[PDB]
Amino acid sequence: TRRAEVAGGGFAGLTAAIALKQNGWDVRLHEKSSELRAFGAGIYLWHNGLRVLEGLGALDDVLQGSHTPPTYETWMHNKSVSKETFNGLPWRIMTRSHLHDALVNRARALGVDISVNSEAVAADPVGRLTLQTGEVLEADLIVGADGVGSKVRDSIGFKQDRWVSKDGLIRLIVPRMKKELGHGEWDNTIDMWNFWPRVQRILYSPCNENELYLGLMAPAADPRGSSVPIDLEVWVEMFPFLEPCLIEAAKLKTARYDKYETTKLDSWTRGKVALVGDAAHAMCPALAQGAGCAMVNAFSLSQDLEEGSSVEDALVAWETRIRPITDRCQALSGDYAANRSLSKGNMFTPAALEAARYDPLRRVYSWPQ
């Protein structure tokens, strides 16, 4: 029986833990925080993430209580400029807690040993993980799924470029208020852009009958539109049709203006250590693939560990096989974010949807456009 030690209890670490435990690994997972929780309010998944959830035995619990809008709509200056449905490609909006709780419930059902208040502070490619307590754990595989600030990565030393933006956005869950919104297509995703009379955008993202995910985006140089708790007037002025939801948003004193952040590395492996998720490839969120690529890569790691090879060799084959999809998606996401490409509408082209089209279970691209 092969042993894996996983650092990080986010989507990458929980996916790796479940996938490895289903293949007969003895897996233990270490989360630094004192509780198992996910920040960020809401999240989109696409076919590729949903197929990972199927492969993990967690798809049902995610689809119950989450939403596929009838269309992904874009507005520019309150005019609908596109409505896209991706020729049937599956996608889904949910709260972060919904996704994260479905994964924890599945890891617990399978008997993955999960520890909280358990931080990985150093790792050794020969298969050792040191916790903040000074416990040294030996394993046949070490998974660094410890986020953009991964200590598994930085204790070993990987050549990298890391960037944190000055700009960011405010992501919140509020009640749907659907009756109070009155006439409209309030089950849709609506990406509501404006450059005039100021730069303000809301991505409107229903999660289910009760819960609405809003992303309120304004530049950090705008002291009102970047304020938390939200400056209700500046948001109601440019999105008056969402006033019932904005009034609920303005009650949230836990709101944060979170910044964008990216990582790109020379490599994702060293000996028996694999870096998965934002530890390796954090990206701009324009294509809503950061967690999709983290989950595809974590599940794909598990697949390459079933080939009969040494763990070291399986890790090299895994990066070689799967990294190009993530490098392309990171680059394209970044290009769309810098160019504000989504503001044009009709930008979920075949190329943009390549990562979402990938099926990690069959290892082919599906849902042709």
Ligand X SMILES: Cc1cc2nc3c(=O)[nH]c(=O)nc-3n(C[C@H](O)[C@H](O)[C@H](O)COP(=O)(O)OP(=O)(O)OC[C@H]3O[C@@H](n4cnc5c(N)ncnc54)[C@H](O)[C@@H]3O)c2cc1C
Please report, as ranges, the residues that interact with ligand X according to CB under 6 A: 7-13, 30-33, 40, 43-44, 119-120, 145-147, 151, 169, 258, 260, 277-278, 285, 288-292, 294
Whole-number minimum distance, CB 283 to ligand X, in Å? 7
Neighbours of 140 (CB within 10 A): 16
The DSSP element (H or E) to which 6 belongs, if any, is strand 3-7
- DSSP 8-state secondary structure symbol assigned to residue 210: S
Closer CB to ligand X, 235 or 237, in the complex: 235
Closer CB to ligand X, 169 or 247, in the complex: 169
Tell me the three state secondary structure of residue 76: strand
Closer CB to ligand X, 97 or 180, in the complex: 97
Whole-number minimum distance, CB 13 to ligand X, in Å? 6
Whole-number minimum distance, CB 14 to ligand X, in Å? 8
Cα distances (Å, whole numbers) of residue 15 to 148, 313, 342: 17, 21, 29
Closer CB to ligand X, 119 or 237, in the complex: 119
Whole-number minimum distance, CB 204 to ligand X, in Å? 13
Whole-number minimum distance, CB 147 to ligand X, in Å? 3
Helix axes 290-304, 311-339, angle to 10 degrees: 170
Closer CB to ligand X, 59 or 145, in the complex: 145
Whole-number minimum distance, CB 110 to ligand X, in Å? 18
Whole-number minimum distance, CB 190 to ligand X, in Å? 15
Closer CB to ligand X, 240 or 291, in the complex: 291
Closer CB to ligand X, 172 or 294, in the complex: 294
Q: Are strands 120-124 and 79-84 parallel, antiparallel or unpaired?
A: unpaired
Tell me the three state secondary structure of residue 194: coil
283-286 long-range Cβ contacts below 8 angstroms, 24+ apart: 283/329, 283/330, 283/333, 283/334, 284/260, 284/330, 284/333, 284/334, 284/336, 284/337, 285/260, 285/333, 285/337, 286/333, 286/334, 286/336, 286/337, 286/341, 286/342
Closest CA to 96 of 183, 211, 197, 5: 211
Give the whole-angstrom CA distance, residue 252 versus residue 239.
18
